[PDB]
C-alpha cells in the first residue's frame, strides 16, 4: 500500500479539485477566464500536480509569489502564462525575460531601467508587464490618476516591454458590510475611463478573488484569480453561509501508531514537564508527528486525533517529532493501526476550520505551514500516484 | 552583496557553533564523547553544513529523527555513525543496512523479525542497534528489569544484529526541582548493575541532554547528546541563570524593503480587515515575509523589526507573503534598505527568546518551523558562501 520508514503522510484528492473548478466556471460570466493561484507550494498542497490538473480542467493562466516559484513550473513542462504578484528586483529582469515570466510593476523609474537592461543584452525576448493599482489595500501599487498616466506613457515608449494587464485587490470582500468593497470598485473603473478619454486602449482587466467572485460575480471583467476555493475551503464563515457555491476539501493527514503499553509500574509521568500522570491501567499510544512538522505545540493537553472512528485526546506536552495519546483504561490498540489527524474516518471528522478556530487563526495558515518533510500522495479517478 | 529576486534570507554563523562545542568540551569529563543532534533540518538551521562543521570540531556521532533524514547526510559524504531516535518500520530494515544507519529498538519480536529479514537475504552487513530504556518519560522504550533481559538475550541470539549502545532520556532536567532526575538515574543505574551481575558486558552508555550535561556533568558516563546548546540557545531561563557555561546565538533573519509611500490620498486603510488606518503624512513600508514563511499571524499589530537601528511596529494584519510596517509622520527610508527580523542591528537586538515569550512557546519551536523556501547563507571565519 504505502511503505515508509517514518509513518506519516498527506493525501490530496484531485477529483475534488476538478469539481471545485467546475462549480466556479458555472457561477461567473461565460466571457471571463480563470487564473489559478498556486503560490507557497500550492497553499501547502504541492504546486506542480495541482497546476497541471487545473490547466486541463478550466484555468488558462497561473499566479505565484516569486520568480523562483515560477521557474519550478516551467521546468515541470508548463507552457502557460505565469504572473508574479509581489515585487521583483531589477537584478532578475534578464532571467525573468529568459524564462518568460510575467512581472508586476508600478513605477516610472523601474520601467525605463528594465528596458535599457534588455536593450544592451542584445534583445531575445520581450518582457511582459502587469500594472498594479492600489485602491485601498495599501500594500503595493500606484495611487493617483496622474501617476498612473505617467507609467502607461513610459511603458508605451519602451520597445522591449509589453503591456498585458492591469489589476487591483479588495481587502474586505469576505465581510458582510460591503461599504469598502464598492468604494474600491468606483475608484478603479474611474481611473481607467480617464485612460480611455486619452485615446489609450486597455488590455486584460482582473480584480476579483475567491470571495469577490462568489459575492460580486458582475465584477469578473476579463479574468478572476481563484485561490483558496481551488482547494475546497471558504474565505470566511460568512461566505460559506451564503450557500451559493459548494466546495469539497482536498487535503487530509494520517499516521500509524508506533507503540502501545499499560502504565502499571512506577513512575507514571508522560512527556516533558511531567504535566500528565497516568493511572495503573491506562493505555498510552505513541505517534510520529511533532511541532517541527507543523502540528502546533499549542495543542498539548488540548487536541484530538481519530482512532477507530472515535476522538481520543493528546496526553502531555507535544514534542518536536512525536505526540502521545491516551486510549483510556484497558485501551484497545496495536502497533500499526491507522490514525487520522485532519480529515475523515468512518463516521467522524476533524476539519481544518475546527483546528484553526481552536488556535485563533484562519484555515489559510493551517495548510500552508505543513512542512515539506512530509510526503504528498495524489488521488485521481480512485487511483494513487506521486 | 546578495542578489535575490524576492529579497529575504537567513544567515548561520559557524564560527559561533565552534565556540559552543569548545565551551561544552571544557565543562564535562574528558573521558566522554559528544554526539551532535541535527534532526529536523538541524533545528531549522540546515542539516548538512552544521553536521560537517561539528564533526570537524569535537563531535563523534550524529542523531536524526528518521532514516530519510540520515540518507540526506550520507548523500553529501558524511561517513560518521548516525542513530535514529524514533521508531523505524520493518519496511526499511534492508535499506538501513545498505546505507549503514543505526536504529533504536526495545522489543523481542522486532529483533527476531529484523534478524530474519537479513538472514533470508544472506546480507554481509550487520545492522547496529541501540536499546532504549524508559525510566520516566513514557514515550518509547522498555520498562522493567525482567523484560530488558529477554531483549538483551534475543539481540544476542541474533547473528545479523550488533549491540552498540544503551540509553535513556531525562524528562525534567531543566527545572529547579531535581527530585525526578535523581530517581530516573537511580533506576537506570540499578538496571545496569543488575545486568553486570549476570556475566554481561555493556556497550556505550548515554543519558544526558544539553540541560543535564550542564547541571549534572557527573552523569556524562560514556557520551552525551548535545542538541539545543549547539545552536547557541539555553534549554530554560533557569539553566541560563546558573551561569555555568557561555553560549553564543548562531542565526539571524533579514530582508530588504520593497516599496515606500506617504499616505496622502484616501482611503488610508492598511491590509486585510482594514484594522489599521494611517495618517496623511505617515510613511508606510512593505517587506517580503509572511506566515507561510513561518512568521506567525499572531504577530498582527504586535511585533517589531529593526530599521536603521530602531524598532518599528507591524501595521495591520500579517499576510501570506508580506508584512507592512510604519515609519511615522515623515519617516526616513528608501526602497532597498536592510531590515533585521531576528537578531542584532547597530545597538539593538530582537532575540528568538523574546519572540518565543510573546507567543507562549519555546525557542525550539520558533527556529525549527522556518520554511525551506527561505535561502540560508553560511559564515565561516567572517565571510560568506551558500
Ligand atoms: C493579489 C491576490 N489575488 C488573489 C489571491 C488569491 O486569494 P484567495 O485565496 O482569497 O482567493 C491572493 C492571495 C492575492 O494576494
Ligand atoms: C531523546 C532525545 N535526546 C536528545 C535530544 C536533544 O535534546 P536537547 O536539545 O534538549 O539537548 C532530543 C531532542 C531528544 O528527543
Ligand atoms: Cl497588493
Ligand atoms: Cl524516548
Q: Tell whether A50 and A193 lie within a shared domain.
A: yes
Sign of CA dihedral B77, B80, B81, B84: negative
Angle (nearest 5°) at CA A353 between A348 and A356: 120
Query: Given B203, B231, B259, which residue is the final one in a domain?
Result: B231
Domain annotation covers residue A13: no
Q: Are A101 and A73 in contact (CB under 8 A)?
A: no
Look up residue B202 and give its DSSP letter.
P
CA–CA separation, B167 and B153 (whole Å): 17
Among candidates B299, B314, B316, B315, which has minimal Cα distance to B355? B299
Taking phi first (over 0 means left), then psi (-120 to 50 degrees means alpha), and beta for anything else, what does residue B231 get? Answer: alpha
Look up residue A242 and give its DSSP letter.
T
Kind plus residue range of the DSSP H or E element containing A34 = strand A33-37
Output the CA A133–ligand 3 centroid distance in Å: 8
Shortest distance, CA B221 to any CA of chain A (angstroms)? 23
Angle (nearest 5°) at CA A306 between A305 and A308: 150
Contact B267/A95, CB-based, under 8 Å? no
Hey, how many other C-beta atoms are within 10 angstroms of the C-beta on A177?
7
CA–CA separation, B304 and A98 (whole Å): 38
- Ligand 2 pocket mutation, candidates B65, B106, B141, B209, criterion most atoms within 8 A of CB: B209
Angle (nearest 5°) at CA B381 between B375 and B385: 30
Query: Given B172, B203, B231, which residue is the final one in a domain?
Result: B231
Q: Are B247 and B275 in contact (CB under 8 A)?
A: no
The domain that holds B223 is classified in CATH as 3.20.20.10
**Elucidated via:** X-ray
Hey, how many other C-beta atoms are within 10 angstroms of the C-beta on B126?
15
Q: Are B228 and B235 in contact (CB under 8 A)?
A: yes
Q: Tell whether A170 and A214 lie within a shared domain.
A: yes
Among candidates A73, A11, A88, which has minimal Cα distance to A37? A73
Phi, then psi, of A262 in degrees rounded to 5: -100, 135
The reply to whether ligand 1 has any atom less than 6 angstroms from the CB of A339 is no
Sequence positions preceding breaks in chain A, C–N over 2.5 Å: none
Contact B291/A140, CB-based, under 8 Å? no
CA–CA separation, B324 and A29 (whole Å): 35
Q: Tell whether A162 and A269 lie within a shared domain.
A: no
Q: Tell whether A285 and A223 lie within a shared domain.
A: no
Q: Tell whether A380 and A327 lie within a shared domain.
A: yes
Domain annotation covers residue A82: yes
Q: Which residues line ligand 2 (CB under 6 A)?
A: A 320; B 37, 85, 169, 209-210, 225, 227-228, 235
CA–CA separation, A58 and A221 (whole Å): 17
Q: How far is CA A197 from CA A98, A133, A201, B13, in A?
A: 36, 19, 10, 58
A319 touches chain B (CB under 8 A): yes
Three-state SS at B103: strand
Residue A278: its chain B contacts at CB < 8 A? 138
- Of the candidates A39, A231, A276, A291, the residue annotated as catalytic is A39
Kind plus residue range of the DSSP H or E element containing B19 = helix B14-27
Report residue B361 CA to chain centroid gap. Answer: 15
Among candidates B99, B106, B209, B205, which has minimal Cα distance to B149? B106
* DSSP codes of every residue in A85-112: -S---GGGHHHHHHHT-EEEE--HHHHH
Domain annotation covers residue A116: yes
Tell me: is residue A320 an annotated ligand-binding position. yes
CA–CA separation, B136 and A270 (whole Å): 7
Structural domain harbouring B337 = 251-385
Q: Are B374 and B6 in contact (CB under 8 A)?
A: no
Taking phi first (over 0 means left), then psi (-120 to 50 degrees means alpha), and beta for anything else, what does residue B35 get? Answer: beta
Nine cell digits for residue A67: 520568480
Domain annotation covers residue A244: no
Q: Tell whether B197 and B323 lie within a shared domain.
A: no
The count of C-alpha atoms lying within 13 angstroms of the C-alpha of B291, restricted to the half-sphere facing its C-beta, is 21
What residue of B is the nearest CA neighbor of A71? B5
Among candidates B279, B271, B181, B189, which has minimal Cα distance to B235? B181
Report residue A167 CA to chain centroid gap. Answer: 20
Catalytic status, residue A272: yes
Nine cell digits for residue B120: 533470508
Q: CA-based diameter of chain B, in Å?
A: 86
Long-range contacts of B90-98 (CB under 8 A, 24+ apart): B90/B114, B90/B117, B91/A3, B91/A4, B91/A5, B92/A5, B92/B67, B93/B117, B93/B118, B93/B127, B94/B118, B94/B121, B94/B123, B95/A5, B95/B67, B96/B67, B96/B127, B97/B123, B97/B125, B97/B126, B97/B127, B98/B125
A67-75 and A47-55 helices cross at what angle (nearest 10)?
70
Domain annotation covers residue B6: no
Q: Are B137 and A270 in contact (CB under 8 A)?
A: yes
The domain that holds A365 is classified in CATH as 2.40.37.10
Among candidates B226, B322, B170, which has minimal Cα distance to B34? B226
Among candidates A9, A83, A29, A78, which has minimal Cα distance to A50? A78
Query: Given A231, A263, A282, which residue is the final one in a domain?
Result: A231
Number of domains making up chain B: 2
Contact B364/A88, CB-based, under 8 Å? no
Task: Identify the residue whose C-alpha is closest to ligand 1 atom 1.
Answer: A169
Look up residue B232 and give its DSSP letter.
T
CA–CA separation, A294 and B369 (whole Å): 7
Cell 547473528 appears where? B159
Q: Are A188 and A169 in contact (CB under 8 A)?
A: no
CA–CA separation, B61 and B37 (whole Å): 9
Kind plus residue range of the DSSP H or E element containing B49 = helix B47-56
Q: Are A134 and A142 in contact (CB under 8 A)?
A: yes
Q: Tell whether B99 and B197 lie within a shared domain.
A: yes
Angle (nearest 5°) at CA B67 between B66 and B71: 125
First-to-last alpha carbon distance for chain B, in angstroms, is 13
Q: Tell whether A218 and A284 lie within a shared domain.
A: no
Do strands B323-329 and B223-226 pair parallel, antiparallel, or not at all (unpaired)?
unpaired
Nine cell digits for residue B385: 558562501
Three-state SS at B350: strand
Q: Is the peptide bond before B267 cis (omega within 30 degrees of 0)?
A: yes
Angle (nearest 5°) at CA B276 between A186 and B284: 85
User: Which residue intervals of chain A are DSSP H helices?
Assistant: 14-25, 39-43, 47-55, 67-75, 93-99, 108-120, 145-157, 179-197, 210-215, 237-241, 352-359, 363-368
- Ligand 1 atom nearest to A226, measured from its CA: 11
Strands (E), chain B: 8-13, 33-37, 61-64, 82-84, 102-105, 127-132, 161-167, 205-208, 223-226, 251-256, 259-262, 282-287, 304-307, 310-313, 323-329, 338-345, 348-350, 376-379, 384-385
The closest CB to that of B284, out of A69, A91, A138, belongs to A138
User: 336-365 in B: which are within 8 Å (CB) of A?
Assistant: 360-362, 364-365
Do strands A304-307 and A310-313 pair parallel, antiparallel, or not at all (unpaired)?
antiparallel
Q: Tell whether B334 and B259 lie within a shared domain.
A: yes
Q: Tell whether B49 and B109 lie within a shared domain.
A: yes
Three-state SS at A340: strand
Shortest distance, CA B377 to any CA of chain A (angstroms)? 17
Q: How far is CA A325 from CA A83, A260, A331, A355, in A?
A: 45, 10, 11, 17
Sign of CA dihedral A217, A220, A226, A228: negative
Q: How far is CA A140 from CA A33, A131, A133, B271, B273, in A?
A: 24, 10, 8, 10, 16
The reply to whether ligand 1 has any atom less than 6 angstroms from the CB of A39 is no
Phi, then psi, of B190 in degrees rounded to 5: -75, -20
CA–CA separation, A81 and A128 (whole Å): 10
Q: Tell whether B280 and B316 lie within a shared domain.
A: yes
Phi, then psi, of A162 in degrees rounded to 5: -140, 135
Kind plus residue range of the DSSP H or E element containing B115 = helix B108-119
Kind plus residue range of the DSSP H or E element containing B357 = helix B352-358
Burial (CB count <10 Å: 0-12, 13-18, 19+), residue A295: buried
CA–CA separation, B13 and B376 (whole Å): 11
Domain annotation covers residue A103: yes
Domain annotation covers residue B210: yes
The closest CB to that of A136, out of B87, B183, B267, belongs to B267
Instruction: Summarize chain A as % helix, strand, coil (round to 5).
Output: 35, 25, 40
Shortest distance, CA A14 to any CA of chain B (angstroms)? 23
Q: Tell whether A89 and A211 lie within a shared domain.
A: yes
Q: Is the peptide bond before A267 cis (omega within 30 degrees of 0)?
A: yes
CA–CA separation, A140 and A135 (whole Å): 10
Q: Are B293 and B8 in contact (CB under 8 A)?
A: yes
The reply to whether ligand 1 has any atom less than 6 angstroms from the CB of A37 is yes
CA–CA separation, B366 and B66 (whole Å): 21
Domain annotation covers residue A237: no
Q: How many helices (H) and strands (E) does chain A have?
A: 12, 19
Amino acid at each position: 500500500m504505502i511503505k515508509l520508514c517514518r509513518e506519516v503522510w498527506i493525501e490530496v484528492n484531485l477529483d475534488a479539485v476538478k469539481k471545485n473548478l467546475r462549480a466556479i466556471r458555472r457561477h461567473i460570466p461565460h466571457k471571463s477566464k480563470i487564473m489559478a493561484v498556486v503560490k507557497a507550494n500550492g497553499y501547502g498542497h504541492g504546486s506542480i500536480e495541482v497546476a497541471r490538473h487545473a490547466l486541463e480542467h478550466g484555468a488558462s493562466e497561473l499566479a505565484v509569489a516569486s520568480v523562483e516559484e515560477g521557474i519550478v513550473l516551467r521546468k515541470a513542462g508548463i507552457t502557460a502564462p505565469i504572473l508574479v504578484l509581489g515585487f521583483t528586483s531589477l537584478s532578475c529582469v534578464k532571467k525573468s525575460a529568459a524564462w518568460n515570466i510575467t512581472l508586476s510593476a508600478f513605477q516610472v523609474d523601474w520601467m525605463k531601467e528594465a528596458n535599457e537592461i534588455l536593450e544592451k543584452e542584445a534583445s531575445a525576448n520581450r518582457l511582459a508587464i502587469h500594472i498594479n493599482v492600489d485602491t485601498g489595500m495599501g500594500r503595493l501599487g500606484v495611487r493617483t490618476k496622474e501617476e498612473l498616466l505617467e507609467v502607461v506613457k513610459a511603458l508605451k515608449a519602451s520597445k522591449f516591454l509589453r503591456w498585458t494587464g492591469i489589476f487591483t485587490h479588495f481587502s474586505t470582500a469576505d465581510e458582510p458590510d460591503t461599504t469598502l468593497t464598492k468604494l474600491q470598485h468606483e475608484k478603479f473603473i474611474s481611473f481607467l475611463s480617464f485612460l480611455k478619454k486619452q485615446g489609450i486602449e486597455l488590455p486584460t482587466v482582473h480584480m476579483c478573488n475567491t470571495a469577490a467572485a462568489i459575492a460580486f460575480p458582475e465584477f469578473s471583467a476579463d479574468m478572476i484569480r481563484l485561490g483558496i476555493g481551488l482547494y475546497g475551503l471558504y474565505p470566511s464563515a460568512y461566505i460559506k453561509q451564503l450557500n451559493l457555491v459548494k466546495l469539497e476539501p482536498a487535503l487530509s493527514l494520517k499516521a500509524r501508531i508506533a507503540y502501545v503499553k499499560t502504565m502499571r509500574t512506577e513512575p507514571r509521568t508522560v512527556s516533558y514537564g511531567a504535566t500528565y500522570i497516568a493511572e495503573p491501567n491506562e493505555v498510552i499510544a505513541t505517534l510520529p508527528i511533532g511541532y517541527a512538522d507543523g502540528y502546533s505545540r499549542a495543542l498539548s493537553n488540548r487536541g484530538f486525533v481519530l482512532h477507530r472512528g472515535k476522538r481520543v485526546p493528546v496526553a502531555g506536552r507535544v514534542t518536536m517529532d512525536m505526540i502521545m495519546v491516551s486510549l483510556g483504561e484497558n485501551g484497545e490498540g496495536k502497533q500499526g493501526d491507522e490514525v487520522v489527524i485532519y480529515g475523515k474516518q468512518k463516521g467522524a471528522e476533524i476539519s481544518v476550520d475546527e483546528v484553526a478556530e481552536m488556535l485563533n487563526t484562519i484555515n489559510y495558515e493551517v495548510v500552508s505551514t505543513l512542512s515539506r518533510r512530509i510526503p504528498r500522495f495524489y488521488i485521481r479517478d480512485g487511483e494513487i500516484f506521486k
